[PDB]
């Protein structure tokens, strides 16, 4: 069902860290600081984490959605910022897995789409 | 440019209310109470301002992205839903676009939707921060 994305992910994750990280390091230069390396990459390396866990849906990653949103939170990373990476970050898998292209995006889509909304929900939470 | 988007949304902006409102009020009828239409129909209408506002991008409609954010946590709405909802908005006009390249309509719409949406979630945070 996310068959492809998620088979994908798991052979990709190397390079998708790395990635991830590099636009993590690249919209932070746009704020009024830039935490390290490091940092960016543990933030990666857990959302690799959650996405493996989400095969089915949000629902198995409970617990590592609530940390990454408490984490951005605490560390932070304003919503807008998070929100603007996780954006970054489907369509730069994106260039990697085109590499139909319309039938692709909608299948990142449906992966991603509810991941990412239960991750704001639990950052809004982490204030509410 | 935004162009090509933005003139589709100026030119079908009564047909845009419609579908959004909609989507709305779909999207409630799994929540625990549904609003009225009236209520859904102004929120479709403030986000349509908001767009119509942001063809550069999401700065001159600050005051308006923040009223909308607060509003629809003051009236119950989670993010969870408002998130749904403003993805749903643009796929739903995808498939109004599209059936006028499909994947440089989806990057061009990204491209204007984006940045406003985003904004509009950090004002809904905000508003408990
Ligand atoms: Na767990």
Redesign the interface.
Known sequence: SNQTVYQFIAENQNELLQLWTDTLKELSEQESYQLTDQVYENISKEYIDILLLSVKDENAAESQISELALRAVQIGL???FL??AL?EFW?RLYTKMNDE??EL?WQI?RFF?PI???I??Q???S??
């Open positions: 304003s919503m807008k929100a603007t954006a369509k292209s319309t995006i889509d789409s990412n909304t239960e704001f929900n950052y809004s939470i204030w509410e």
